[PDB]
Design a protein around this ligand. Structure first.
Ligand SMILES: *C(=O)N(NC(=O)OC)c1ccc(NC(=O)c2cccc(Oc3ccccc3)c2)c(C)c1
Ligand SMILES: *C(=O)N(NC(=O)OC)c1ccc(NC(=O)c2cccc(Oc3ccccc3)c2)c(C)c1
Lengths: 276, 276
């Protein structure tokens, strides 16, 4: 694949053929390989250029995406995609070029014509899903908003319940762990937190490289703590096993898994007797 | 909150009290605010330090997380969390300190004692969920793997079906858009692609700022393309509306939404008559 270095990304593209430049902009799949059979039909008439949009395929970002890009009224990515096509056209051709986009790629194409019309000789919009200018825009926008919200959230909320039952988490803890944050910003962060924890923390931490020998070397320093109100939960069985194999003491301490905030006075007083 | 700048992050923490340092390491919620009621009980005996682990809360990364950190056998994040606690202890105390971690924070605590025992005076593991050293480790590891996989994937696969029906996508297209990649790497990328598209592209692009006036200025340059095998789908109604309001021609072209790869010869020949 060829590469054009632009601000914030290396833009990769396929190129075959001879003649005027024809740029294909992919839709939701994001990659230009889907146009290669077509390019083989067109290569005697056009210099065909199939682009992997910067967030997909063999293209790569060289700076993080702005944090705000997850906002549904962000316009950074569509404008940056359009600028990518314009700078690609300028790098390959001293004349305006032919452009075809499909699906979200036809929306990119729209923004190329809006912002960089001077690079466009002729342009085609194949099956665009844009709604902004439609009489029923709000209907389709609200449908998109609803479905995205459904996909991103409901699997996660059900999954945390399943985890709770596998771990035998106590109701007093589960009610607290599932309570919504008190701000729209916090509720967004809450969701982001939990998805991050699922993908980047639970599996990595729970199967990380700790052995019982790591404990025996410093056994005099260690206390194991089990909540009085979280009996029967998985972590208590972990502590029972550690104690079985090392003799490190288990100390019962008030509350459940969140006992340090459920019963702070009792949690503190046990720590003070331990260490104070 | 106080801040300690470390490699790759600014580590934020709460600090209250007087006496020996006691560091609290949070579990899955990731933030130290959950320990503040406890800190108020302990502040006459200990300098209490509640940390927001670097990926959570008011802490922030100053370098992107390595791409490989999503791998379930990655150890970067737990070791980096443990090093954070060790460097925090060294910055606040010339003597070894007291440490308590709960849940995934107790796993961080384990790694502090493993790798930096010299900072530890006494340490407590409150309800640890680590399985690596258990006789039934593989059972619980496989359960974790299964549940994470279920949460991350099934909502997405059902959602793309719902989207298809709302958009009235043709079966020949839906079968192709849902076919799995041919490599484990590609299947992972496929999933990552589709989640990215849902959060960062669909809503932003479909409601982006394009007006009919943007089309009328350059109407002579534009062709609208509808697939012959995707009749009744939403994007064709978009093109009908554009044509209604601008007179820009609609050209029928073979195949469905993916007609450029379903029927490349026919797609090419229509483009050649258009532009060749
Ligand atoms: C544009 O590409 N789409 N908009 C539209 O209105 O199309 C009729 C669109 C394409 C695909 C899908 N659904 C999918 O299952 C999907 C979403 C994201 C990525 C991919 O990967 C893919 C796409 C095409 C070909 C191969 C791979 C598929 C929707 C909802 C909209
Ligand atoms: C450790 O924190 N956990 N491991 C364990 O075995 O606990 C018994 C743990 C905590 C919480 C949950 N489930 C949740 O619903 C959850 C997951 C991630 C983040 C949060 O946010 C949260 C957590 C505690 C207090 C407030 C907010 C909750 C599991 C599955 C394990």
């Amino acid at each position: 694949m060829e590469t054009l270095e632009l601000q914030g990304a290396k833009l990769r593209y396929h190129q075959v053929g001879q003649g005027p430049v024809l740029i294909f902009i992919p839709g939701a799949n994001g990659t230009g390989d889907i146009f290669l059979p077509l390019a083989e039909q067109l290569k005697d008439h056009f210099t065909v250029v199939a682009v992997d949009r910067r967030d997909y395929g063999e293209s790569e970002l060289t700076e993080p995406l702005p944090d705000s890009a997850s906002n549904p009224d962000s316009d950074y990515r569509v404008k940056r995609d359009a600028q990518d096509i314009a700078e690609l056209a300028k790098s390959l051709s001293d004349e305006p070029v032919y452009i075809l986009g499909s699906s979200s790629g036809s929306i990119v194409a729209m923004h190329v014509l809006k912002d960089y019309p001077e690079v466009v000789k002729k342009i085609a919009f194949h099956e665009p899903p844009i709604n902004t200018f439609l009489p029923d825009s709000t209907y389709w926008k609200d449908k998109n908003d609803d479905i995205v919200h459904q996909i991103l959230t409901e699997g996660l909320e059900k999954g945390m319940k399943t985890f709770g039952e596998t771990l035998n988490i106590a109701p007093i803890d589960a009610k607290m762990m599932s309570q919504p944050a008190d701000t729209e910003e916090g509720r967004i962060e809450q969701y982001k937190r939990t998805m991050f924890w699922l993908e980047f923390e639970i599996r990595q931490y729970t199967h990380s490289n700790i052995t019982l020998d790591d404990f025996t070397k410093y056994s005099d320093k260690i206390t194991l703590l089990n909540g009085t109100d979280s009996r029967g939960s998985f972590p208590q069985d972990v502590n029972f096993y550690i104690n079985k194999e090392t003799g490190i003491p288990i100390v019962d301490i008030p509350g459940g898994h969140l006992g340090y905030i459920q019963k702070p006075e009792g949690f503190a007083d046990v720590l003070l007797n331990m260490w104070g």
